[PDB]
Design a protein around this nucleic acid. Structure first.
Ligand SMILES: [Zn+2]
Lengths: 49, 145, 100, 103, 114, 59, 115
RNA sequence: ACAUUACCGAAGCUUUGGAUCUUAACGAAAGUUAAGAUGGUAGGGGAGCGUUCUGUAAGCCAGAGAAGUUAAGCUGGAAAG
RNA sequence: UGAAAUAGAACUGAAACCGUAGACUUACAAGCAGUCAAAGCCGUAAUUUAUUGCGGUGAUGGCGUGCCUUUUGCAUAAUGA
């Protein structure tokens, strides 16, 4: 027993997402409702629609 | 140790002892008579009234055939019923219903004004209506009102 | 019965079912408020008696400028022209008493 | 004989030799309580009613303990919105033994 | 680094089933029905905890009104005189008084009628 | 023509208990051997019936 | 509860518990003679299976308690549980197949000396 | 319809406790008080519970009964212990 | 025989599901089945002893349109188990 005693703020946790309603990042997991963006994608080419 | 309960008091219905009240309906108005009867039956004249349980007294109505109405109700008030068969709607004006069943108008009115459900039906069980001026419950020494 | 007519009828009945006693109480309060506002350079205590929900945007802004956010709000103000104008704007939602 | 007494704005029916469960009272006043706002006194037949307090009438009590109630849970959830909240709670109560009712 | 040990779901379910003991039919043993009924029950519990105050005050008012039916004081007028003569006794207390000791309540009423 | 919702265990239990119910046959002890035989039937143990042999009971 | 000296148990018998339970109801609590007569009379597969188990239970009781004859014994308790299942295939039209479960039952009978 | 005096009536307000946060003051800080502010989907920020594995651990608790399931009771503001 | 034979062709044996026994309740009743009040009966503990608690059942009263997706809006007779 010597208790390394990490400095505070030295490691953020993560943004674990899609793991329940209470975490605020629930079913939709930060993506919104529908559309192109809800399914992995966004047209990259500096695109302006 | 003992704690003084400062909570609402409920009186055990096995220590309440039901009396009978005679109400005369001669020359009175149908709705007023029914309201009085309902207030007595419900238990709303006792300090320990409770809507859960049956704590009010019982009521005997005499002279039920002499209730007076106002307006043209004697000719115009309709009592409806349905046989549950198609088209089987039967109406019955106050005159005809009174002649065929002298106690029917007052019984119907009281049944309408009583609450609904098992306790309401029980309260209506607690009521006796007589057409004439005499009743058969002389053994209970009912208190006149 | 046609839906247009029954909606109009239901709304008309609700509107018309207001109590003259309540209206008289409101009239008395309004008269008292106008009498107080007619004064000049006195400290007046303002109570908020009607909610902010559903009222006009301009009037909500006026009430928050007076300092009242909830019903039961108590604020003492010195009657000058500015406060008099604000009180006149929002006379129907306030109760004015006077600070002797 | 009993008293109708107000403590911290709550009525109670005090009887001698007999506990009252009231809202938690401060640790400062865990020694010996005197209550001066008596609303009514019934003594062996005759009753005195205060306007609003019966004068020259005290209740003297001894603080006994604090005790927590059963746990209650406040729960709410929004249909087909996937959101809720749950909160526990346990209210604390103080028990005082009424010694005498100055009547 | 597989992290499977399933001693968690059984725990949730055991707590839920412990709280849902006396329910009718399949709501007492199945996980899905028990969780649905419990969750709506707890929300009912909150709502009803706030409603109990209204219910009991209504009961007290009705009891007072019943105890006054004898005399000629309608209890709106009774509350009137009560405030006007500055007697700050409570609805619960008066309701209980009219049952435990009727004559004290009657004396209060005689005193109000002034 | 298909069940709309699964019935409750109460309804299933009620129907099952009412239908799957078999009735006891009547009895009457044989005048010869004292066995309890079905009333109005030849005794299956001794063969007599109203004091008359009709069977020859084997193994 | 069981005086396991006095009992018989028949495991994996070839009948369905739904079909054997009513016969058990008709003899629960009866005297041994009456129960044996009922089971001999009634022409049900479950009746025959119960007959064997009940006779065995009475035999065990008699063997361990020599002063107990056939007419002080009454069938105290009777329990019929469900046992292993076997699935076989029943083929139907259009290449559709259905699975066709065969159920077995456990039977537990305890006798006791009459009142 | 018009007047007089009332009452009922919500999670609004007042009263009685208890929790967190912000601001201000006191205080050496810790904290103690004064004020208000805490419905919430999409979405942003912060703080925790629990699971597995490794170091701490050739430690500690176990055949006098370990993990696991099961019953009762109890505790925390929730996960849960 | 074995420490164990509900280790006997199988360790630990949960839930779904199927029973038996006992306690209470149910055949005048319209119950998203739960929650808030609540008599009677049963078990237990106190206060000497028929009144309070904790428990289990529960006559009766008030309130109450499952859940998840997707929607301006779903008890919806929209989807899904
Ligand atoms: Zn024979």
């Amino acid at each position: 027993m010597f208790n390394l005693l990490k400095p505070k703020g030295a490691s953020k946790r993560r943004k674990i997402v899609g793991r329940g309603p209470g975490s605020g990042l629930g079913k939709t997991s930060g993506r919104g409702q529908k559309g192109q963006k809800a399914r992995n994608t966004s047209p990259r080419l500096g695109f302006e629609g | 140790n003992k704690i003084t309960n400062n909570d609402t008091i409920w009186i055990k219905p096995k220590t309440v002892e039901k009396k009978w009240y005679v109400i005369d309906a001669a020359d009175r108005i149908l709705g007023k008579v029914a309201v009085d009867v309902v207030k007595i039956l419900r238990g709303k004249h006792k300090a320990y009234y409770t809507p859960h349980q049956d704590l009010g007294d019982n009521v005997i109505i005499i002279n039920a055939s002499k209730v007076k109405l106002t307006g043209k109700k004697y000719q115009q008030k309709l009592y409806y019923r349905h046989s549950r068969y198609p088209g089987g709607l039967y109406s019955d004006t106050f005159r005809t219903l009174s002649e065929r069943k002298p106690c029917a108008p007052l019984e119907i009115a009281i049944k309408g004004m009583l609450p609904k459900g098992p306790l309401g039906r029980n309260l209506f069980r607690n009521l006796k209506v007589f057409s004439g001026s005499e009743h058969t419950l002389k053994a209970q020494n009912p208190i006149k009102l | 019965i046609k839906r247009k007519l029954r909606l109009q009828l239901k709304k008309a009945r609700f509107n018309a079912s207001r109590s003259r006693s309540k209206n008289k109480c409101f009239i008395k309060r309004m008269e008292n408020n106008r009498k107080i506002i007619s004064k000049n350079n006195i400290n007046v205590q303002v109570f908020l008696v009607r909610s902010l929900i559903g009222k006009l945007n301009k009037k909500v802004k006026v009430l928050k400028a007076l300092g009242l956010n909830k019903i039961g709000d108590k604020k003492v103000h010195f009657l000058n022209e500015s406060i008099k104008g604000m009180l006149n704007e929002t006379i129907n939602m306030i109760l004015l008493s006077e600070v002797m | 004989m009993y008293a109708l007494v107000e403590i911290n704005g709550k009525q109670y029916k005090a009887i001698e030799g007999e506990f009252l469960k009231i809202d938690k009272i401060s640790p400062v006043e865990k020694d010996k309580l005197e209550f001066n706002s008596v609303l009514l006194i019934n003594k062996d037949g005759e009753v005195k009613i205060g306007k609003p307090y019966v004068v020259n009438s005290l209740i003297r009590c001894t603080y006994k303990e604090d005790k927590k109630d059963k746990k209650v849970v406040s729960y709410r959830y929004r249909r087909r919105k996937s959101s809720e909240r749950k909160v526990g709670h346990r209210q604390t109560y103080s028990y005082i033994l009424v010694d005498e009712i100055v009547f | 680094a597989r992290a499977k040990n399933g001693t968690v779901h059984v725990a949730r379910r055991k707590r839920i089933l412990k709280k849902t003991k006396g329910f009718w039919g399949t709501k007492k043993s199945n996980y899905k029905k028990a969780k649905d009924t419990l969750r709506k029950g707890m929300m009912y519990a909150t709502r009803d905890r706030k409603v109990r105050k209204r219910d009991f005050r209504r009961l007290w008012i009705s009891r007072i009104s019943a105890a006054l039916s004898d005399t000629g004081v309608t209890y709106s007028r009774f509350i009137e005189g009560l405030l006007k003569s500055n007697i700050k006794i409570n609805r619960k207390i008066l309701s209980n008084l009219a049952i435990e000791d009727v004559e004290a309540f009657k004396k209060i009423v005689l005193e109000i009628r002034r | 023509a298909v069940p709309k919702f699964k019935p409750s265990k109460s309804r299933s239990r009620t129907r099952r208990s009412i239908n799957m119910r078999k009735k006891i046959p009547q009895f009457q002890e044989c005048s010869n051997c004292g066995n309890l035989g079905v009333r109005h039937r030849i005794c299956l143990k001794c063969g007599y019936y109203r004091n008359n042999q009709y069977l020859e009971i084997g193994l | 509860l069981v005086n396991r000296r006095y009992t018989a148990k028949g495991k994996n018998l070839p009948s369905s518990p739904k079909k054997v339970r009513p016969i058990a109801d008709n003899i629960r609590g009866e005297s041994y003679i009456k129960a044996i007569a009922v089971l001999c009379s009634m022409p049900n597969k479950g009746a025959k299976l119960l007959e064997k188990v009940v006779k065995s239970a009475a035999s065990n009781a008699m063997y361990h308690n020599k002063n107990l004859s056939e007419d002080m014994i009454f069938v105290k308790t009777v329990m019929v549980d469900d046992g292993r299942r076997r699935k076989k295939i029943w083929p139907r039209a259009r290449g559709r197949a259905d699975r066709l479960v065969n159920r077995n039952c456990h039977i537990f009978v305890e006798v006791d000396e009459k009142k």
